[model samples]
Target: GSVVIVGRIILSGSGSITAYSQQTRGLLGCIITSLTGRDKNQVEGEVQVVSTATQSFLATCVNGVCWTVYHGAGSKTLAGPKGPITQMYTNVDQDLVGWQAPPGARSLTPCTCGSSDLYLVTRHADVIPVRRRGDSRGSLLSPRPVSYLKGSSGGPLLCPSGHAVGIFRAAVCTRGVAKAVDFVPVESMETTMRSPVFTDNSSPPAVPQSFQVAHLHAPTGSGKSTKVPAAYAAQGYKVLVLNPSVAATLGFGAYMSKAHGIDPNIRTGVRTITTGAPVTYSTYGKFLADGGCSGGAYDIIICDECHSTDSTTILGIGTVLDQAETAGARLVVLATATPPGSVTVPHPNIEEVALSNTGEIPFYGKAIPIEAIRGGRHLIFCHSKKKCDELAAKLSGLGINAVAYYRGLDVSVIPTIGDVVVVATDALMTGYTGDFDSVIDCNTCVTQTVDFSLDPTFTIETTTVPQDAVSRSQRRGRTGRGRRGIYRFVTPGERPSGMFDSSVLCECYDAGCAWYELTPAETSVRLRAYLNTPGLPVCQDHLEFWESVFTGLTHIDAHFLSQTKQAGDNFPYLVAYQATVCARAQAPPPSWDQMWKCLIRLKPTLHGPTPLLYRLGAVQNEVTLTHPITKYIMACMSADLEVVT
Candidate 1:
């Protein structure tokens, strides 16, 4: 079934891209208006117009001719051969334009050196090798000559691998044949094609924007976290806050910041848009997942914890900074107490603009843990939720009234007015203005150093970063409003005679070493299974992998990472195309109430600050299917009809 003509090729005339059009497409234009929005008259003359697979678009060139070509989607989006080389050479006679790459060459890549055999397709689908070399802005040309053809125009210029570096531009011929053909680099193709035609659908009034903005203004009773968002909202600009507490206190957007137990609708998932007042509030964790950044319409983005060193929040801060850039927001305010230095930004244009300070933020407490206990109120700060529980338990064993505060926990039970020490991930860091004595930043700082035998050679120098300077300032600055107090990272395990005792230091160091190894338990479990190394120490590879998992993952990532390595560290679009996993992690057993409830304070779109209680019933029972989560909670209450009904 092959037409074997091996001598010379003839230029094919006009051809259709042959998109798989439907036979029933416009046939019912006159029948049902509901089924067919517009009626049309068709003659023999014909017509046609058009991500997941491949979609067609209207591409009009300056010569004013228009044609249809598939616009690749996702990773398939056109990229210059990122791993192949210099000079290209190919000797193919004919091939299809915009055709699928051969299975063997599907992973072609870009490179810096060496000649690579390439195949360039012509408008008529003929293959030519263009020898011209360069980057995204340049062209490619061939030295051989062939009969100049009629339909020789835009087509793919592919590298040894499947990736396309450029597309056919035009032909330069000699005598009566083709000497060279220019290619428009794929980079330029993309850079110049930023303008996609817009439709006049009257959904929301279009807002024209073309400006750049970014940074922080210093603070105090001047309301560093408070005043600016209120003013921006008053001026009719949409605002986004990095903290749920700040969002709740300021009042706008949704009610996530407003209450304790997560409203049942949170089960609907994060990323829900605020349909009311323009202000939206979210925590750093949620922001990392783009939870509350619906539509990128923010005019003011206020990030309060830029000083936070938590791996997750840094990724969150980095992304939010980029969001302010593309959204063309009028103002982006990133405020932290210790004139922040820890935060990194994705964009180069964003800079730090120091605003005149209205009040002096004092650094309180001591470096000695013993001094911390002998004194008055010492609010110890923890790294995460789990750390809060651990540190609180430790201090309580040593006979100190160390109460751990987390969501759903009452502050009244923790007597902040006494010599008692309250520990938590945050909250108490700035909640009060009374004479708080000392502050301890109970971080997983690895203050203790330890050596591993099995992992010694695998490179385990230092897994812990030095205690963050900004973190110290944020926690220490909000101390003993009236006087200085003890502020140290290492908490006391027993009665201390003085500061820096060898025994005290040893205990602290030992605790730190243990914490460091155990911090990423989730990752640890996965790594052990991956390597089949049941007793594997936290090696450099484990830590490296954990860092990726720590910042690079959301709940959705666990599912994909759990199943396949084919994704390579993880899949890009698989991540960018999230949420098949959302349903899995999201719809947990309702007794998992404390789980989402604790999460509610972090994302308003998960549910508002105002309560919208879901369900608390059986799969189909008297409790009624209110909010799905509420229904599940009741259905699984492990509680009976006396009060449950």
Candidate 2:
């Protein structure tokens, strides 16, 4: 019932991906439809399997026609531990290939292939699209040669949906220039079971679980990620979801809308980017949304974020270790993806902490050399794909960009110039990191980042600065440490005049925010937080207030004060926190770098402009406070950053 399936079928004619494109089989792709099979569930001894296009299970060709020189060459042997593939079957017409191995992939995630979206996703991770289908002497064909790119042959194709849609084939060439690529469109895949889920009934549906591997039917209610939770919330069952990828994207909106809103019948508060109403989401609003999870005999949970490999994201590595040891268990290991190799000639500054793989349990208690793992930024690898996430999170706990990958887990995006450790799995590593294809390409991931930050309220997790001054200076030499205009979220004054209309959508009225400035004889300074009693439509009306402070301003600065216990809550209160500074040659640049990229959260609803005072830590604000959080005060330009208290 389970087998390992992959998008790419890596065949290296030595190290040249181009070499295999011209081989007798051209290139092969591993695309299985939901109606066929999903991913392998077992964690170890995994090998990729692809659809074998043959009309008969019996050998019909001559020895030379099917076997090749690369098949047994000691130097050009195949990569990775390929499964025995001792058996082959024939489907209705010609396509058939099934994975074999006793403890075969133990758990598999349903592939969301057959997407109607027009682009293509491959194992090489390149951005290719299914251009209007073309033809040859009676075969299904399509555009561009991704197969020519090594590691992508036999790779499956997908869309922005990150789901599969095509089964990659070989390429066609004109003279020597490879022309078009080919594939077996997933939409036309040969499958009889059309089990698309339609779970979203306006009413509550029956529940099924204990972690059921549904043998997912593609598009199993595109809303399963939505409808199920919506149904739970609809039936008054408190639900919490951790679909990180979607939680970080717009999909959170869809989930929240149908699950919880001001829909009279629903009082549930499903978390998303912004908290538009009086409902509370979890501290991990973008990762874990636990709404009133008070449980002993109660609490509903839906971990949608696809960190499927571990059963759970080993967030508490030490705790897991401590418990495992306490339980006297030895097996500790997990995958996001397999590494190709690491003959990557060391970059000049690349420090080689070449610690050979030691399967010793004795050192499990010892801490990893923090310096090599944390202080350095480069790629690292293991032999098994299953261990990627397990080890990656442990590396993450140490504060380094150790990358990870898995069947449905969002990013294991490998092989990039990023400061990531690129924690990956590898086999037959004969030297070639450049040929490894798993990094995010042109559109999707980049597209995800930009638009995700587009929401009215959100945080960029942890934007970083170089660890050393030399690097900082080098970056500044290019574009400087930061930009000009400063910003903050000025919600309201204590007089209690500012408020908002929030429900299905949000509206801001009398959005008052108090701020002061420091202007010399002619060093102009101003603040534009409080809406001059304007009945502004929350946000669409306020638009991106980022545009407000840019025009006609020299120097302006504001002060603030805001968390989730140890939990770190993102911005819940938003208004204005931007100012300009036109400091003079007589001043010390008026502290232009004080609060550049910081955000100001409200201490309480429409409460203290004072909660902001103590919260802003400290500023050069030399104002006398009589009763800070209880009173309201503002002033025009005086000499010393004249902020009233």
Candidate 3:
């Protein structure tokens, strides 16, 4: 049943009109319609007369303007109550049926409800208060158990003050039974109904001179560091750009001088030459190691990659910045593709610009061979040195000249031009921007979901999909810098069902289940060697723990079977570590857990057993094996299982 009413009604002078009318508080401005055919016609009747006058009709004032709100009628002409009509905005999704009121007629105020308690005008001219409900998807649902019918779908949800919050869109049903109702918020409806605008002024305000420290946010490869510092220098102000690495100092040097139109001098290690240049480029380590400023205080000091102040070297660099500020350095600008949590500059100006990626130079030649994507003068990024070694050897076997570059390697020795490929780890992701013909990311190194159980001993696994988009972007951006180049992302296959099972994902099984496979003694030596390497992402605590496990164990037995049930609990250590790595990589915090799982899954080959093997905890009981040796081994660590001689 439904109801329709005009905004105003007139009375004739024949006689005193004695009529029955249902008085409602919210009926003064609302419009209603019916979708079915009309069987009979009536000028005015009982409150229940609306149920019979369901025939759709059109009405017009001949010379007056009218409005219509039709929600689901696409290309369907909406005739007026008396004649043909014109349609305004029509959206099929909202199911809104609208019509313009006559001049001087009372209009419904466009208002939004601040609270959930609302009133629904019924067809019988009754106003019913209904409390709103929410679903898991955050969509608003009608109060349950009420079972609103299809006729009530177009009614307005109004506040106590007659302000409309939403319009009833449809009845939500379950198994053909009407369970609740759904409504569209009035704000969204108004947005769709309004005219489109061209510009938005929601961007952050520009940096003002009143601010001393300016923190900028821009994506990597935007050339933010290169452009900002150079612009300041070109303005005739003495500029000092602080970099964190030798490679960064070298890479940004040429661009800084070129942009400023001044051939600036660069300094590294103890080589402190050309201190009076208008634009000077130097590593943070050298600045702190020597005097904060070799010559007079600079007008501006820009910190590139300002997020890395956590490192001791960077901390020293930050300390120098503090001193320079006290020594009267003016207008500090901190630019980074990755900004840190807190800016140290007091009362600093902030400007954020989005640089366009319109200009991309073409590549000189193909980076990868026809069948070899990971070969050539490729800069391959792996998770660890051991993986680099394995890849280097594989490329060598195919008669490719290859070398593994990591922290412990002799980076001082430069490679002569040839078909040389350098397979490196995270250390290579930053600093050096050498012209690598191609880049191969052999590891996603995602630490989002690491399994911390004892059976496989701290093993991690991951779903095939990337858990973090920012990380994927960072790995992809490493290659296509100077010119277009090839980037091959070598990721693992689909994640095992056990990767998602909480009990299996984080649970450590019995210590002596011969279900684990033991690696050969030679392989164990290589694992130990990799553990001792300098550039692995594993922290000191994790490194020390693994070292003790390797020194204590004679053999390493790894797990073989995936879990029966998918685990939901995330490995805490891996989550924290992945977060830490993301911070270092200047990427966003991981949203997906499988990222770290993938990294941990591949960790066992080089890092010995998982962190569980080193945990000072008791082993759980498991079903026994048939062999006497296996039984004895289980008894030594299992809580309930024991072998009797």
Off by over 4 Å in 1: 1-209, 220-222, 244-275, 288-292, 325-328, 339-376, 381-400, 404-419, 423-435, 440-466, 482-645
Error of 3 at 147 (Å): 41
TM-score-wise, the better of 2 and 3 is 3
Provide the lDDT at 138 for model 3.
Answer: 17
Q: Tens-digit lDDT track for model 3 on 357-387?
A: 2222111111233344434566666666676
Local accuracy of candidate 2 as per-residue lDDT tens digits, 1-645: 112232222232233122111111222322232123333333221113322322101111111111111101101111113332322221211121222233322211123543333343333334454443442111213433322433333344444443444444434332222344444444333241233212322222344432111111112124544555455556654444433232222444444656665221112123234333222222122221121122331124333322121101211111222232233322212101110110112123212221222422111122233443343333333323455567677767756676664333334265346455554432211112132211111000000010111112212232211112111111112111122211111111011011111110111110111111112111111112112112111111122222221222222233321211111122112212221111111112112232423332211222222222112123332322333221221111111110000
lDDT for each of the candidates? 0.35, 0.26, 0.41
RMSD of 1: 26.2
For each of the candidates, the C-alpha root-mean-square deviation to the true structure, in angstroms, is 26.2, 30.1, 20.7
Stronger candidate by lDDT (1 vs 2): 1
Q: In angstroms, how far off is 23's CA in candidate 1?
A: 86
By lDDT: ranked, best first: 3, 1, 2
- CA lDDT of 188 in candidate 1? 44
What are the models' TM-scores?
0.34, 0.21, 0.38
Per-prediction tally of clashes: 28, 41, 41
Clashes of 3: 41
